[PDB]
Nucleic acid binder design. Structure first.
Ligand SMILES: O=c1ccn([C@H]2C[C@H](O)[C@@H](CO)O2)c(=O)[nH]1
Ligand SMILES: O=c1cc[nH]c(=O)[nH]1
Lengths: 243, 245
DNA sequence: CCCGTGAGTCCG
DNA sequence: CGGACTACGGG
């Protein structure tokens, strides 16, 4: 599935490279272009067989995946526990306050540190997490307004969001079919809900569940995110598979 | 001789003057199927405007599921494809609202106005050659407008400033189209086109009759109870049934 | 982020 | 002379 999975991402990059954003959207980065190499290293190293479980995020945050090309790709955990590195280039148009520095980005993505710290504690080594699991985002683009502020797919005006999310809904169907996934875990309500509508519409044979999003913008994530999600994972019965 | 070429250059020149307008405010999207649906359009004019005409039917502007998809006036997909037998590649506008995508001849929707319009002529004439022997069909304005959520805006829903130069420019191209075609009689489909055409042709002193038929729009309840029956009677009264065997 | 409250569009 | 569906601010 590594090669097939990367083909789906390349075909999705092609359809997205034709969209045009505006309005409050002023910058659009695709790390699956300028951080293709560590992305493709992550997929070749960790996507070696079919998967039972897909964790699905919404999109890149500015300091993790936007820098490293790896879902929830906070720099220290990507460098040190996943052991993925690779050259990173730059978007053609950078916001000054959001330049791409790759594996030299000084900021920690809180969402990504939390997410990989959890699976690091639970699984020990990355091979144990990836025996049956994989992690991916619904949307590979990141968007800023004039002042460098992040607009998630949800903050896009409706006219710009429906366009984009229908194209990613279709790439998501293709991803789930190539990986053989039986269980999609939406990270946050938006991915959970989006994946469920999209997959049910194609009648793919797959169950869609959810865990809480780690984001620090989520006030409930700021006490005990790890403890709440260890309890959600136990309920979905995936701890089993993570040992 | 044959007006096809000249009709196209009229529309090509109107396309030019229009490409220069900036729209505002409530208007967020503007399409022009004469650019991205040029090929079926040009195929319809060449196939059916080979000779000079007695009557021009005139509509206001493309609807989102008829002419906006097929480039043919009142251009509901099934009738254009199966009755007029007009095909061509259709590409997309520069900027599309997600509720108003252009799918060309793959558009699954059947525009009610357009399906009504051509189904009348199909029943009345049999074959398209009979209807086009002396008639043709065109719109006053080739553009389509949408607000921020994809809702259609008619040319008259436009802020007066934009509305007036747009119509004035269309009026001018309409007077040429009428000259190029040779028509004795313009029938506006719906009130706006009838009135606008009367005001455009009288104001440049063209010696042409302007009449009217009810518009087939399902927004009008009288059209939903028996449009075809009303318009057959209106066409009788105008003496045009003889032209359409 | 997650949810609640509620306004634009369709009902051809 | 409503029903369903699907922006934005505060927790
Ligand atoms: O008893 C009544 C009658 C009417 N209406 C409102 C709703 C309806 O749309 C309109 C009259 O039919 O006024 C009510 O709320 N209650
Ligand atoms: O890659 C990422 C990072 C943050 N949040 C997500 O949903 N996915």
């Amino acid at each position: 599935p590594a090669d097939s999975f990367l083909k789906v991402e390349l075909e999705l990059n092609l359809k997205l490279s034709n969209l045009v954003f505006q309005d409050p959207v002023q910058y659009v980065y695709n790390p699956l272009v300028y951080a293709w190499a560590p992305h493709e290293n992550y997929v070749q190293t960790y996507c070696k067989s079919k998967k039972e479980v897909l964790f699905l995020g919404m999109n890149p945050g500015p300091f993790g995946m936007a820098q490293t090309g790896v879902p929830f790709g906070e720099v220290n955990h990507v460098r040190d526990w996943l052991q993925i590195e690779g050259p990173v280039s730059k978007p053609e148009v950078e916001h000054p306050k959001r330049r791409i520095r790759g594996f030299e980005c000084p900021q920690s993505e809180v969402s990504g540190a939390r997410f990989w710290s959890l699976f690091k504690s639970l699984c020990g080594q990355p091979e144990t997490f990836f025996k049956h699991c994989f992690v991916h985002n619904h949307c590979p683009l990141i968007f800023m307004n004039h002042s460098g502020k992040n607009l998630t797919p949800t903050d896009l005006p409706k006219a710009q969001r429906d366009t984009l999310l229908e194209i990613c809904d279709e790439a998501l169907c293709q991803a789930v079919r190539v990986l053989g996934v039986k269980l999609v875990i939406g990270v946050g309500r938006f991915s959970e809900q989006r994946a469920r509508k999209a997959l049910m519409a194609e009648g793919i044979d797959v169950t869609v569940k959810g865990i809480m999003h780690p984001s620090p913008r989520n006030p409930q994530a700021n006490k005990g995110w790890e403890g709440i999600v260890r309890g959600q994972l136990l309920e979905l019965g995936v701890l089993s598979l993570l040992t």
